[PDB]
Coordinates of C-alpha atoms and ligand atoms in Angstrom, one line a residue:
Chain A
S43 CA 0.0 0.0 0.0
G44 CA 2.6 2.5 -1.1
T45 CA 5.6 0.6 -2.4
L46 CA 5.8 0.7 -6.3
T47 CA 8.5 0.1 -8.8
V48 CA 10.3 2.7 -10.9
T49 CA 10.6 2.9 -14.7
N50 CA 11.4 5.4 -17.4
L51 CA 8.8 7.7 -18.8
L52 CA 7.0 6.9 -21.9
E53 CA 8.4 9.0 -24.7
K54 CA 6.5 11.0 -27.2
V55 CA 3.2 11.9 -25.6
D56 CA 4.0 15.5 -25.5
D57 CA 0.7 16.6 -26.8
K58 CA -1.4 15.2 -24.0
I59 CA 0.4 16.8 -21.1
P60 CA -0.4 20.5 -20.2
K61 CA 2.4 23.0 -20.5
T62 CA 2.4 24.1 -16.8
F63 CA 3.1 20.5 -15.6
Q64 CA 6.1 19.9 -17.9
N65 CA 9.2 19.8 -15.6
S66 CA 7.6 18.4 -12.4
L67 CA 5.8 15.3 -13.6
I68 CA 5.3 11.7 -12.8
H69 CA 3.1 9.1 -14.6
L70 CA 0.9 6.4 -13.1
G71 CA -1.6 3.9 -14.2
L72 CA -5.3 4.5 -13.5
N73 CA -6.0 1.5 -11.3
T74 CA -2.8 2.1 -9.2
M75 CA -3.7 5.7 -8.7
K76 CA -7.3 4.8 -7.9
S77 CA -6.0 2.3 -5.3
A78 CA -3.7 4.6 -3.3
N79 CA -6.2 7.6 -3.4
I80 CA -4.1 10.0 -5.5
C81 CA -5.9 12.7 -7.6
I82 CA -5.0 14.4 -10.9
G83 CA -2.9 17.5 -10.6
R84 CA -2.3 17.2 -6.8
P85 CA 1.2 16.8 -5.5
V86 CA 2.7 13.5 -4.3
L87 CA 5.6 12.8 -2.0
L88 CA 8.3 10.3 -2.9
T89 CA 10.5 8.7 -0.3
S90 CA 13.3 6.2 -1.1
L91 CA 15.0 3.7 1.3
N92 CA 17.8 6.2 2.0
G93 CA 15.4 8.8 3.4
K94 CA 15.7 11.3 0.5
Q95 CA 12.4 12.9 -0.5
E96 CA 10.8 14.7 -3.4
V97 CA 7.4 16.4 -4.2
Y98 CA 6.0 16.0 -7.7
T99 CA 2.7 16.2 -9.7
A100 CA 0.6 13.2 -10.8
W101 CA -0.8 12.7 -14.3
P102 CA -3.1 10.0 -15.4
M103 CA -1.1 8.0 -18.0
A104 CA -3.5 5.4 -19.2
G105 CA -0.9 2.9 -20.3
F106 CA 2.1 2.6 -18.0
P107 CA 2.3 -1.0 -16.8
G108 CA 0.0 -1.2 -13.8
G109 CA 2.2 -0.8 -10.7
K110 CA 4.9 1.4 -12.2
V111 CA 5.8 4.9 -11.3
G112 CA 7.6 6.8 -14.0
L113 CA 10.3 9.3 -13.3
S114 CA 12.8 11.3 -15.3
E115 CA 16.6 10.9 -15.0
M116 CA 17.0 14.1 -12.9
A117 CA 14.5 12.7 -10.4
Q118 CA 16.4 9.4 -10.4
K119 CA 19.7 11.2 -9.6
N120 CA 18.0 13.6 -7.1
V121 CA 16.3 10.9 -4.9
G122 CA 18.9 8.3 -5.7
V123 CA 17.1 5.7 -7.9
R124 CA 18.2 3.1 -10.4
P125 CA 15.4 1.9 -12.7
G126 CA 14.2 -1.3 -11.1
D127 CA 14.1 -0.2 -7.4
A128 CA 11.3 0.4 -4.8
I129 CA 9.9 3.8 -3.8
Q130 CA 7.2 5.1 -1.4
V131 CA 4.4 7.3 -2.9
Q132 CA 2.0 9.3 -0.7
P133 CA -0.6 12.1 -1.3
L134 CA -0.3 15.4 0.5
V135 CA -3.1 16.4 2.8
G136 CA -1.4 19.5 4.3
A137 CA -0.9 23.0 2.9
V138 CA 1.4 24.5 0.2
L139 CA 2.4 28.1 0.6
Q140 CA 4.2 30.7 -1.5
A141 CA 7.9 31.0 -0.8
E142 CA 9.5 34.4 -0.5
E143 CA 13.2 33.9 0.2
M144 CA 15.3 31.2 -1.3
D145 CA 19.0 30.8 -0.6
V146 CA 20.5 28.8 -3.5
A147 CA 24.2 27.8 -3.8
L148 CA 25.6 27.7 -7.3
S149 CA 27.5 24.6 -8.1
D150 CA 30.9 24.9 -9.6
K151 CA 31.3 28.3 -11.1
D152 CA 30.8 29.2 -14.6
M153 CA 31.2 32.7 -15.9
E154 CA 29.8 34.7 -13.1
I155 CA 26.4 35.3 -14.5
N156 CA 24.0 38.2 -15.0
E157 CA 22.1 37.7 -11.9
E158 CA 18.7 39.3 -12.7
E159 CA 18.1 37.5 -15.9
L160 CA 19.4 34.2 -14.5
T161 CA 16.7 34.9 -11.8
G162 CA 14.3 35.5 -14.7
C163 CA 15.2 32.1 -16.2
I164 CA 14.8 30.4 -12.9
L165 CA 11.3 32.0 -12.2
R166 CA 10.2 31.4 -15.8
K167 CA 11.1 27.7 -16.3
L168 CA 10.5 26.6 -12.7
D169 CA 7.1 27.7 -11.5
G170 CA 4.9 25.8 -9.0
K171 CA 7.9 23.6 -8.0
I172 CA 7.7 22.5 -4.3
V173 CA 11.1 23.0 -2.8
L174 CA 13.0 21.1 -0.1
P175 CA 16.5 21.6 1.3
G176 CA 19.1 19.5 -0.4
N177 CA 17.4 19.2 -3.8
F178 CA 19.0 20.1 -7.1
Chain B
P12 CA -10.7 31.9 16.1
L13 CA -7.9 33.9 14.4
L14 CA -7.0 33.6 10.7
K15 CA -3.8 34.8 9.1
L16 CA -3.5 37.2 6.1
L17 CA -1.3 36.3 3.1
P18 CA -0.5 38.1 -0.2
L19 CA -2.6 37.1 -3.2
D20 CA -1.5 35.0 -6.1
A21 CA -1.0 36.0 -9.7
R22 CA -4.4 34.5 -10.7
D23 CA -6.4 36.4 -8.1
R24 CA -5.1 39.9 -9.1
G25 CA -8.1 41.9 -10.2
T26 CA -10.7 39.1 -10.0
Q27 CA -12.5 40.0 -6.7
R28 CA -12.0 36.6 -5.0
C29 CA -11.6 35.8 -1.4
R30 CA -9.9 32.4 -0.6
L31 CA -11.2 30.8 2.6
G32 CA -10.8 27.4 4.2
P33 CA -13.6 24.8 4.5
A34 CA -14.2 25.3 8.3
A35 CA -14.7 29.0 7.8
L36 CA -17.1 28.3 4.8
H37 CA -19.0 25.9 7.1
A38 CA -19.2 28.5 9.9
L39 CA -20.3 31.3 7.5
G40 CA -22.8 29.0 5.7
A41 CA -21.8 30.4 2.3
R42 CA -22.0 28.9 -1.2
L43 CA -19.6 29.5 -4.0
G44 CA -19.6 33.1 -5.2
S45 CA -21.7 34.5 -2.4
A46 CA -21.0 38.0 -1.1
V47 CA -18.7 38.5 1.9
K48 CA -18.2 41.9 3.6
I49 CA -14.8 42.2 5.2
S50 CA -14.4 44.9 7.9
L51 CA -10.7 45.8 7.6
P52 CA -8.6 46.3 10.7
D53 CA -7.3 49.8 9.8
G54 CA -10.7 51.2 9.1
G55 CA -13.0 50.8 6.1
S56 CA -14.5 47.7 4.5
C57 CA -14.5 45.8 1.3
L58 CA -16.9 43.4 -0.6
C59 CA -15.7 40.1 -2.0
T60 CA -16.8 36.7 -3.3
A61 CA -16.1 33.4 -1.4
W62 CA -14.1 30.7 -3.2
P63 CA -12.3 27.8 -1.7
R64 CA -8.6 27.0 -1.5
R65 CA -7.2 24.1 -3.4
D66 CA -5.2 22.7 -0.5
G67 CA -8.2 22.2 1.9
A68 CA -6.2 23.6 4.8
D69 CA -8.0 26.0 7.2
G70 CA -6.4 28.8 9.1
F71 CA -5.5 31.2 6.2
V72 CA -7.3 34.2 4.5
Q73 CA -6.4 35.9 1.2
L74 CA -8.4 38.9 -0.2
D75 CA -8.4 41.1 -3.3
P76 CA -9.9 44.6 -2.7
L77 CA -11.6 45.9 -5.8
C78 CA -14.8 47.4 -4.4
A79 CA -13.4 49.5 -1.6
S80 CA -14.0 52.4 0.7
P81 CA -12.0 55.5 -0.6
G82 CA -8.5 55.4 0.9
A83 CA -8.9 51.9 2.3
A84 CA -6.6 49.9 0.1
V85 CA -4.6 48.7 3.0
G86 CA -4.6 45.1 2.1
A87 CA -0.8 44.8 1.9
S88 CA 0.4 42.1 4.2
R89 CA 4.1 42.8 4.9
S90 CA 3.6 42.8 8.7
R91 CA 1.3 39.8 8.5
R92 CA -1.7 41.0 10.6
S93 CA -4.3 38.5 11.7
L94 CA -7.9 38.9 11.3
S95 CA -10.5 37.5 13.6
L96 CA -13.5 35.7 12.2
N97 CA -16.0 38.0 13.9
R98 CA -15.3 40.6 11.1
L99 CA -16.6 38.7 8.1
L100 CA -20.3 38.8 7.3
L101 CA -22.6 37.0 4.8
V102 CA -24.6 39.8 3.1
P103 CA -27.7 39.3 1.0
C104 CA -27.7 40.7 -2.5
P105 CA -31.0 41.6 -4.2
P106 CA -30.8 42.5 -7.8
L107 CA -30.8 46.0 -8.9
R108 CA -32.8 48.0 -11.5
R109 CA -30.9 51.3 -11.6
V110 CA -27.5 52.4 -10.6
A111 CA -25.8 55.8 -10.4
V112 CA -22.0 56.1 -11.1
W113 CA -19.5 59.0 -11.3
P114 CA -16.6 58.1 -13.5
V115 CA -12.9 59.0 -13.1
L116 CA -11.4 58.8 -16.6
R117 CA -7.8 58.4 -17.7
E118 CA -5.7 61.3 -18.9
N127 CA -18.0 61.2 -25.7
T128 CA -20.8 60.0 -23.4
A129 CA -21.5 56.7 -25.2
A130 CA -18.0 55.2 -24.9
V131 CA -17.9 56.1 -21.2
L132 CA -21.3 54.5 -20.7
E133 CA -20.2 51.4 -22.6
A134 CA -17.0 51.1 -20.5
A135 CA -19.1 51.4 -17.4
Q136 CA -21.5 48.6 -18.3
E137 CA -18.6 46.5 -19.3
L138 CA -16.7 46.9 -16.0
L139 CA -19.7 46.4 -13.8
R140 CA -21.1 43.3 -15.3
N141 CA -22.2 40.7 -12.7
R142 CA -20.6 42.2 -9.6
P143 CA -21.7 42.9 -6.0
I144 CA -21.3 46.5 -5.0
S145 CA -22.3 48.7 -2.1
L146 CA -22.9 52.4 -1.5
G147 CA -20.1 55.0 -1.2
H148 CA -17.7 52.5 -2.8
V149 CA -14.9 52.9 -5.4
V150 CA -14.8 50.2 -8.1
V151 CA -11.2 50.2 -9.5
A152 CA -10.5 48.9 -13.0
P153 CA -8.0 46.0 -13.3
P154 CA -4.6 46.7 -14.9
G155 CA -4.6 46.2 -18.6
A156 CA -8.3 47.0 -19.0
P157 CA -9.5 48.3 -22.3
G158 CA -11.1 51.6 -22.6
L159 CA -11.0 54.9 -20.8
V160 CA -12.7 54.5 -17.4
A161 CA -10.2 54.2 -14.5
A162 CA -12.6 54.2 -11.6
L163 CA -16.2 54.5 -10.7
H164 CA -17.8 56.0 -7.5
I165 CA -21.2 54.5 -6.6
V166 CA -23.7 57.2 -5.7
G167 CA -27.2 55.7 -5.6
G168 CA -29.6 53.0 -6.6
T169 CA -33.3 52.4 -6.4
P170 CA -33.4 49.0 -4.4
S171 CA -30.9 50.9 -2.1
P172 CA -27.3 49.3 -2.0
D173 CA -26.7 50.1 1.7
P174 CA -26.6 46.4 2.5
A175 CA -25.3 46.0 -1.1
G176 CA -26.6 44.3 -4.2
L177 CA -25.9 42.7 -7.5
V178 CA -25.7 44.3 -11.0
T179 CA -27.3 42.2 -13.7
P180 CA -26.9 42.3 -17.5
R181 CA -30.4 44.0 -17.7
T182 CA -29.9 46.7 -15.1
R183 CA -29.6 50.4 -16.1
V184 CA -26.5 52.5 -15.8
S185 CA -26.9 56.3 -15.3
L186 CA -24.3 59.0 -14.8
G187 CA -24.6 61.4 -11.9
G188 CA -21.9 63.3 -10.1
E189 CA -21.1 64.6 -6.6
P190 CA -17.5 64.1 -5.1
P191 CA -17.8 65.4 -1.5
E199 CA 4.0 73.6 3.3
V200 CA 6.4 76.4 3.8
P201 CA 4.8 79.8 2.9
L202 CA 8.2 81.5 2.4
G203 CA 8.1 85.3 3.1
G204 CA 10.4 87.8 1.7
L205 CA 9.4 87.3 -1.8
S206 CA 6.1 89.0 -1.4
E207 CA 7.2 92.0 -3.5
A208 CA 8.1 89.8 -6.4
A209 CA 5.4 87.2 -6.0
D210 CA 2.8 89.6 -7.0
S211 CA 4.9 91.1 -9.8
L212 CA 4.7 87.6 -11.3
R213 CA 0.9 87.5 -11.1
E214 CA 0.4 90.9 -12.7
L215 CA 1.9 89.1 -15.8
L216 CA 0.7 85.5 -15.6
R217 CA -2.9 85.8 -14.3
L218 CA -4.1 87.0 -17.8
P219 CA -2.8 83.8 -19.5
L220 CA -4.7 81.7 -16.9
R221 CA -8.2 83.0 -17.4
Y222 CA -8.2 82.2 -21.1
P223 CA -11.0 79.9 -22.6
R224 CA -10.1 81.3 -26.0
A225 CA -11.3 84.8 -25.0
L226 CA -8.1 86.5 -25.9
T227 CA -8.3 84.8 -29.3
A228 CA -11.6 86.8 -29.7
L229 CA -10.4 90.1 -28.4
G230 CA -6.8 90.9 -28.2
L231 CA -3.3 89.5 -28.6
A232 CA -1.1 87.8 -26.2
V233 CA 0.8 89.5 -23.5
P234 CA 4.2 88.0 -23.4
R235 CA 4.6 84.3 -22.8
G236 CA 8.3 83.9 -22.0
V237 CA 9.3 85.1 -18.4
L238 CA 12.8 84.8 -16.9
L239 CA 13.7 84.6 -13.2
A240 CA 17.2 85.5 -11.9
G241 CA 18.9 85.7 -8.5
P242 CA 21.6 84.4 -6.2
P243 CA 21.8 80.6 -5.6
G244 CA 19.7 80.2 -2.5
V245 CA 16.9 82.7 -2.6
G246 CA 14.3 79.9 -3.2
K247 CA 13.6 80.4 -6.9
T248 CA 12.2 76.9 -7.6
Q249 CA 9.9 77.0 -4.6
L250 CA 8.4 80.3 -5.8
Chain C
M73 CA -30.6 8.4 -3.6
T74 CA -32.3 11.6 -2.5
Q75 CA -29.1 13.6 -3.1
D76 CA -28.1 11.5 -6.1
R77 CA -30.1 13.5 -8.7
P78 CA -28.8 17.1 -7.7
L79 CA -25.1 16.5 -8.3
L80 CA -25.6 14.6 -11.6
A81 CA -27.8 17.4 -12.7
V82 CA -24.8 19.8 -12.5
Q83 CA -22.3 17.2 -14.0
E84 CA -24.2 16.7 -17.3
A85 CA -24.5 20.5 -17.6
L86 CA -20.7 20.7 -17.5
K87 CA -20.5 17.8 -19.9
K88 CA -22.7 19.7 -22.3
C89 CA -20.8 23.0 -21.8
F90 CA -17.2 21.9 -22.7
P91 CA -17.3 20.8 -26.4
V92 CA -19.1 24.0 -27.3
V93 CA -16.0 25.8 -26.0
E94 CA -13.8 23.5 -28.1
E95 CA -15.8 24.4 -31.3
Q96 CA -15.7 28.1 -30.7
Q97 CA -11.9 28.0 -29.9
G98 CA -11.4 26.5 -33.3
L99 CA -13.5 29.3 -34.9
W100 CA -11.5 32.0 -33.0
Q101 CA -8.1 30.6 -34.1
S102 CA -9.3 30.4 -37.8
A103 CA -10.4 34.1 -37.7
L104 CA -7.1 35.2 -36.0
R105 CA -5.1 33.3 -38.6
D106 CA -7.0 35.1 -41.3
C107 CA -6.4 38.6 -39.9
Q108 CA -2.6 39.1 -40.5
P109 CA -1.9 39.6 -44.3
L110 CA -4.7 42.2 -44.5
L111 CA -2.8 44.2 -41.9
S112 CA 0.5 43.8 -43.8
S113 CA -1.3 45.0 -47.0
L114 CA -2.7 48.0 -45.2
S115 CA 0.8 49.0 -44.0
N116 CA 2.0 48.8 -47.6
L117 CA -0.8 51.1 -48.7
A118 CA 0.0 53.5 -45.9
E119 CA 3.6 53.7 -47.1
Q120 CA 2.5 54.4 -50.7
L121 CA 0.0 57.1 -49.6
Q122 CA 2.5 58.9 -47.3
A123 CA 5.1 58.8 -50.1
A124 CA 2.5 60.4 -52.5
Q125 CA 1.6 63.0 -49.8
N126 CA 5.3 64.1 -49.4
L127 CA 5.7 65.2 -53.1
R128 CA 4.9 68.0 -55.4
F129 CA 3.7 67.2 -58.9
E130 CA 4.7 70.3 -60.9
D131 CA 8.4 70.5 -60.2
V132 CA 8.9 67.1 -61.9
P133 CA 9.6 68.1 -65.6
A134 CA 8.2 65.0 -67.2
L135 CA 4.9 65.2 -65.4
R136 CA 3.4 68.3 -67.0
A137 CA 1.4 66.6 -69.8
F138 CA -0.8 64.9 -67.2
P139 CA -2.1 67.6 -64.9
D140 CA -4.6 65.6 -62.8
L141 CA -2.6 62.5 -61.5
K142 CA -2.8 63.1 -57.8
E143 CA -6.5 62.5 -57.1
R144 CA -6.7 59.6 -59.6
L145 CA -3.8 57.7 -57.9
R146 CA -5.2 58.7 -54.4
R147 CA -8.7 57.4 -55.5
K148 CA -7.4 54.0 -56.5
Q149 CA -5.3 53.6 -53.4
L150 CA -8.2 54.4 -51.2
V151 CA -10.6 52.1 -53.1
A152 CA -8.1 49.2 -52.1
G153 CA -8.1 50.4 -48.5
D154 CA -11.9 50.2 -48.3
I155 CA -11.8 46.6 -49.6
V156 CA -9.3 45.5 -46.9
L157 CA -11.3 47.2 -44.1
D158 CA -14.6 45.6 -45.0
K159 CA -12.9 42.3 -45.0
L160 CA -11.7 43.1 -41.5
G161 CA -15.1 44.0 -40.2
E162 CA -16.3 40.5 -41.4
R163 CA -13.6 38.9 -39.1
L164 CA -14.7 41.1 -36.2
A165 CA -18.4 39.9 -36.6
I166 CA -17.1 36.3 -36.4
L167 CA -15.3 37.1 -33.1
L168 CA -18.6 38.7 -31.7
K169 CA -20.7 35.6 -32.4
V170 CA -18.0 33.5 -30.6
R171 CA -18.1 35.8 -27.5
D172 CA -21.9 35.9 -27.3
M173 CA -22.6 32.1 -27.4
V174 CA -19.8 31.3 -25.0
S175 CA -21.2 33.8 -22.4
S176 CA -24.7 32.4 -22.8
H177 CA -23.6 28.8 -22.1
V178 CA -21.5 29.8 -19.0
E179 CA -24.5 31.8 -17.6
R180 CA -26.8 28.7 -18.1
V181 CA -24.3 26.5 -16.1
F182 CA -24.2 29.0 -13.2
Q183 CA -28.1 29.3 -13.3
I184 CA -28.5 25.5 -12.9
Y185 CA -26.0 25.5 -10.1
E186 CA -27.8 28.3 -8.3
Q187 CA -31.0 26.3 -8.6
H188 CA -29.5 23.1 -7.2
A189 CA -27.2 24.8 -4.6
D190 CA -28.4 24.3 -1.0
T191 CA -29.3 20.6 -1.4
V192 CA -25.7 19.5 -2.0
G193 CA -23.3 20.5 0.6
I194 CA -20.0 22.3 0.4
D195 CA -18.2 19.0 1.0
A196 CA -19.7 17.3 -2.1
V197 CA -18.5 20.2 -4.2
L198 CA -15.0 20.2 -2.7
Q199 CA -14.2 16.5 -3.2
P200 CA -11.8 15.6 -6.0
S201 CA -11.3 12.2 -7.6
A202 CA -8.8 10.0 -9.5
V203 CA -10.4 10.8 -12.9
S204 CA -12.0 14.2 -12.4
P205 CA -11.3 17.5 -10.7
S206 CA -13.9 19.1 -8.4
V207 CA -16.9 21.1 -9.3
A208 CA -15.5 24.3 -8.0
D209 CA -12.3 24.1 -10.1
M210 CA -14.3 23.6 -13.3
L211 CA -16.7 26.4 -12.5
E212 CA -13.7 28.7 -11.8
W213 CA -12.1 27.7 -15.1
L214 CA -15.3 28.4 -17.0
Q215 CA -15.4 31.9 -15.4
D216 CA -11.8 32.5 -16.5
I217 CA -12.6 31.5 -20.1
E218 CA -15.5 33.9 -20.3
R219 CA -13.5 36.8 -18.9
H220 CA -10.6 36.2 -21.3
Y221 CA -12.9 36.2 -24.3
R222 CA -14.6 39.5 -23.2
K223 CA -11.3 41.3 -22.6
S224 CA -9.6 40.2 -25.9
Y225 CA -12.7 41.2 -28.0
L226 CA -12.8 44.8 -26.6
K227 CA -9.0 45.3 -27.0
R228 CA -9.2 44.2 -30.7
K229 CA -12.4 46.3 -31.2
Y230 CA -10.8 49.6 -29.9
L231 CA -7.6 49.0 -32.0
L232 CA -9.8 48.5 -35.1
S233 CA -11.9 51.6 -34.3
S234 CA -8.9 53.9 -34.1
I235 CA -8.1 53.8 -37.9
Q236 CA -8.1 57.2 -39.7
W237 CA -6.8 58.3 -43.1
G238 CA -5.4 61.6 -41.8
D239 CA -2.8 60.0 -39.5
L240 CA -0.7 57.5 -41.2
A241 CA 2.0 56.6 -38.7
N242 CA -0.8 54.8 -36.8
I243 CA -1.5 52.5 -39.8
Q244 CA 2.1 51.4 -40.0
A245 CA 2.2 50.6 -36.3
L246 CA -1.0 48.7 -36.2
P247 CA 0.8 45.5 -37.3
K248 CA 2.8 45.2 -34.1
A249 CA 0.1 46.3 -31.7
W250 CA -1.9 43.3 -32.8
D251 CA 1.0 41.0 -31.9
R252 CA 1.4 42.8 -28.6
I253 CA -2.3 42.1 -27.9
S254 CA -1.7 38.4 -28.6
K255 CA 1.5 38.3 -26.5
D256 CA 0.0 39.9 -23.4
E257 CA -2.6 37.2 -22.6
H258 CA -2.3 34.0 -20.7
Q259 CA -0.7 31.6 -23.1
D260 CA -2.5 28.3 -23.8
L261 CA -5.5 28.8 -21.5
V262 CA -8.3 26.8 -23.1
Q263 CA -6.2 23.8 -24.2
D264 CA -4.9 23.1 -20.7
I265 CA -8.4 23.2 -19.2
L266 CA -9.7 20.8 -21.9
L267 CA -6.8 18.5 -21.3
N268 CA -7.5 18.5 -17.6
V269 CA -11.2 17.7 -18.1
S270 CA -10.9 15.2 -21.0
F271 CA -10.7 12.2 -18.6
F272 CA -13.9 13.4 -16.9
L273 CA -15.5 13.9 -20.3
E274 CA -14.7 10.5 -21.8
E275 CA -15.8 8.5 -18.7
Ligands
ATP301 N1 11.4 82.8 2.0 C1 12.5 82.1 1.7 N2 13.4 82.7 0.9 C2 14.5 82.0 0.6 N3 14.8 80.7 1.0 C3 13.9 80.2 1.7 C4 12.7 80.8 2.2 N4 11.9 79.9 2.9 C5 12.7 78.8 3.0 N5 13.8 78.9 2.3 C6 14.8 77.9 2.1 O1 15.2 77.7 0.8 C7 15.0 76.3 0.3 C8 14.6 76.3 -1.1 O2 15.7 76.1 -1.9 P1 15.5 76.1 -3.5 O3 15.8 74.7 -4.0 O4 14.2 76.6 -3.9 O5 16.7 77.0 -4.0 P2 17.1 77.8 -5.3 O6 17.3 79.2 -5.1 O7 16.1 77.4 -6.4 O8 18.4 77.0 -5.7 P3 19.4 76.9 -7.0 O9 20.0 78.2 -7.2 O10 20.4 75.8 -6.7 O11 18.4 76.5 -8.1 C9 13.9 75.8 1.3 O12 14.0 74.4 1.4 C10 14.4 76.5 2.6 O13 15.4 75.8 3.2

């Protein structure tokens, strides 16, 4: 009742996924998502065996082999996931609130960058992303 | 019970929507879109529509003041004040048949009347209230002041697509001495090109229009 | 059983309301795709008419055997301008019909909810599901669609009503103010709502 198995995301299919949910997305089968009471568009919380966590958005896939959560490769690096492992998926009953101050630490150091339009690229491509300390 | 105040999202800006939790909607007994009068903490009041939060969590209040008392747009929430629930009321809205508005235009009668009908379409409004146009609105009306109505919007009411819109109107420093001698020398020149509704076109010429002020740096020429 | 009929009365009203919005969105995109080469042609005619207005027709030494050329050339150029503008008023009438029937269907949905309001609770409206969003989300999205259609129609109507043949810098700037109207809106609004409600519609 919560332990599923990871797989890669079905390719193509980019004309049936709304544009606001592009970079924050997992895919699930309809009977699996009906079983563990997850709704469409609501966030879910993912916990691995190492105790690393992530908050993403569910989409009805209508296809993925029943019992298979689909994640991208950045998610698999961020939680720490090889394809063929176990993961814990839960729905969120609490509250999500608007952030106002986010201390980010740049990794490495490329050309020091125009800061304000780097902030414009951050706030344009990442919108509605639920943040945790330690995520990339 | 105390509820917090939060700044509004980018989808509630200019929509007249109040975002409440489910326990406050159970205590108010309101449906979706019903009229809620909010008595503000720093004086004044506003009128809003009740819509639920997506999260389902109770203990938070957001509000967008569009129909406001004049000089009561104090809904900025930097200091995070808390509102009590005893200050929100469920207000019945009968439909109206005639309104009376006074428009504040941006810097003919039919375009101003068409822009008033278009702004006030399907909204709850009260008496002595300013309706502010949203940013990016088409047209020329920037604000409306509500003056009167025949089913009497003192406990407020709803404009309908078949109501009538009519236009009435009733809107209810250092002196520096020492330059007195030269202050009126300026007026004996400049008063005559200030009382000119093309009257000097009709009879006369134009006294000069090109004055020059001179003096030492510090006698207060710019303040004159 | 007693409360079974009120909620399914609102749900078939939403099921009737959404494909109407899909059909008029297709009509709106066809009219907006038709409007652009007419505006480019009107900018070309404004260039030709300003270049004719700059010039004197007696100092040119070849053009003395035809001493009436200016009003004949001006008459033809302005007969082509009237053709383009009547074609443009036809596109504006198509956008008006789209706006009117979308607003009537949304008002019908809110009227049937107001009739069946107090029987169903708040908690039946707020409940989501694994195939469908809640009733309150879909009503809010319908209200957003109606407000977007009203605002875009009046912005395009006032831009089309400010065209005069005594000021010609306006006619050469019209082309980019139309693209600035189309770039200021919420991008991909109707398609995201229809993709969210398609699982509720097909079931
Ligand atoms: N009656 C007065 N006559 C002269 N100065 C005054 C008088 N009353 C106040 N002041 C002082 O003069 C200041 C006004 O300075 P102001 O900027 O007008 O100077 P200015 O003569 O225009 O300067 P500048 O020559 O640099 O343009 C006031 O802020 C005040 O400190």
